[PDB]
């Protein structure tokens, strides 16, 4: 819809996603050869957003295991899509690593990514 | 990573029913606590991912999932993601932090996202 | 030092701070007449940062009560100062409102502010 | 807002000793859990703010504070802020979420900040 396609964040990463008609998000995420760096993503979005000019709520997850590498971690992005001539997906994210119990307190990093339709 | 499929309950009275696929998929349903309302009216689709080959040094299993708060009955114009780890054994837990983003106008975007933490156990 | 002075974020807010020699931060925060909008801030920073080009860790708190208004809430900013010709204070923040027990789950909002030495 | 001054303990074995001033100041010390180390080597200055006139409808008292992890003995080149609310009565609590930012190079800034939650009680 407005979401399906390729998106680029400030870090050099690339997000390719299909938004299904009833709320599914499926795709690949490439962190900053390209194929070693590509990971599955899945998520959900609001397939009927409000009609008052509000953004479209959405989230997705990447677990950082593919056929080549396993970082033993997962990131979730939570945010909203904003359409128009300067379309954005504005997110906050949580990256949790698998840890022992003694290290669990420091298992989760937090940050923010802004995605645009063109590269920075 | 073994150990995730099944029913989980958090401190808020929510129920999380998930299947963990062999290659890292999470699929299932998430139900909010109800008192007056019938259960299925507050049941929502979830999807996510988990580490299907965790380190076998006693570390937890990294995972995450998303609920968009739209179903056939209700739409809150919002989405939550949970990020955390599964810890196995006799008192198994899924320990998470979450981000809840509401769809807002640009002027309200700064206040769009709530943060919290949910601890899931196998008993209510 | 590099921190003391006036800082401006993307939202229209103004942060005026003094960094004391041993780690104190004291000042006023003005959210976007000016005086009704001004609140006390206090915090801490690393008064001896690493010498490898790293930023300077710091945090502060504003409780949103002044002589005129009380929102029954408090924000903390956590971040790092980065000096040089384009100096920044890059932060993530948590805004917690006072709530009943039943509403506590939704008490805390999270976001990010980037502060510069000139207005946006 | 009354009720905050004194000693508080979290689930990680840390000790938080704070004075709440009449107009909203928080001042005190924060000590990490120790096993081999002497207590004062892991004790740090804190400052913060709280709502000194909370709503008297059973709501909690909003507050926050900061520790920069430098003392006369050690420097971790980091700072934590806790944001939360004091809840009074017989099982009094300070329920918080926290952000821990490490000083990093620009290339490492994306991974500079950890997030978590601490529950403080009046007993260990
Ligand atoms: O666990 C990992 C996997 C890679 C995560 C990439 C993050 S997802 C949030 C942000 N947005 C992006 O587009 N990319 C970044 N990496 C990792 C974790 C910790 C450390 N470490 O040194 O501590 C090094 C690499
Ligand atoms: O947008 C919503 C949808 C419901 C979210 C439930 C949250 S997901 C994190 C946490 N864990 C759970 O199991 N349940 C809670 N609800 C909502 C949002 C805002 C307000 N509000 O008053 O602002 C009221 C309800
Ligand atoms: O409790 C409040 C007090 C004002 C907080 C301003 C925030 S601090 C993080 C960010 N950085 C800034 O420079 N300014 C913003 N406001 C408030 C809270 C909730 C609602 N609400 O409608 O839900 C309205 C106002
Ligand atoms: O930077 C530090 C300083 C110590 C922070 C203690 C945290 S504050 C939140 C939580 N609540 C507590 O009472 N204690 C913990 N430590 C540190 C940072 C990174 C790593 N690391 O391995 O990456 C190890 C130690």
């Amino acid at each position: 819809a407005g979401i399906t396609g390729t998106w680029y964040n400030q870090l050099g990463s690339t997000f390719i996603v299909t938004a299904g008609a009833d709320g599914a998000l499926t795709g690949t995420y490439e962190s900053a050869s390209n194929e070693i760096k590509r990971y599955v993503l899945t998520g959900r979005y609001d397939s009927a957003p409000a009609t008052d000019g509000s953004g479209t709520a959405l989230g997705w997850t990447v677990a950082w295991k593919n056929n080549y590498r396993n970082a033993h971690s997962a990131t979730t992005w939570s945010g909203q899509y904003v359409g128009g001539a300067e379309a954005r997906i504005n997110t906050q994210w949580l990256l949790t690593s698998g840890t022992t119990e003694a290290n669990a307190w420091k298992s989760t990093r937090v940050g923010h990514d802004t995605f645009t339709k063109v590269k920075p």
Side-chain angles (χ1 to χ4, degrees), chain A residues 1-100 102-120:
Chain A
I3 296 177
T4 290
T6 307
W7 292 90
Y8 306 95
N9 74 14
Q10 76 292 342
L11 287 172
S13 303
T14 307
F15 169 34
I16 297 153
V17 69
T18 300
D22 271 44
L25 300 175
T26 59
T28 60
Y29 199 98
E30 188 182 305
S31 205
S33 152
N34 295 325
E35 247 288 52
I36 286 191
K37 288 195 280 221
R38 280 199 262 256
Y39 299 83
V40 171
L41 78 87
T42 183
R44 304 289 295 167
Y45 76 106
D46 179 3
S47 51
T51 45
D52 57 5
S54 295
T56 300
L58 49 40
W60 66 94
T61 300
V62 168
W64 294 106
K65 184 186 177 291
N66 62 14
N67 289 169
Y68 312 100
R69 286 177 159 191
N70 191 352
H72 304 299
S73 58
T75 301
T76 64
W77 293 257
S78 172
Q80 63 187 136
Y81 157 80
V82 177
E86 244 72 37
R88 296 270 186 287
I89 300 176
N90 295 318
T91 68
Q92 304 193 249
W93 51 256
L94 297 170
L95 166 51
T96 300
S97 299
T99 67
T100 60
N103 290 329
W105 68 273
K106 61 173 183 172
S107 64
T108 305
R109 285 163 149 124
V110 58
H112 52 92
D113 287 347
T114 302
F115 296 89
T116 51
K117 297 252 79 199
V118 309
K119 300 176 173 180

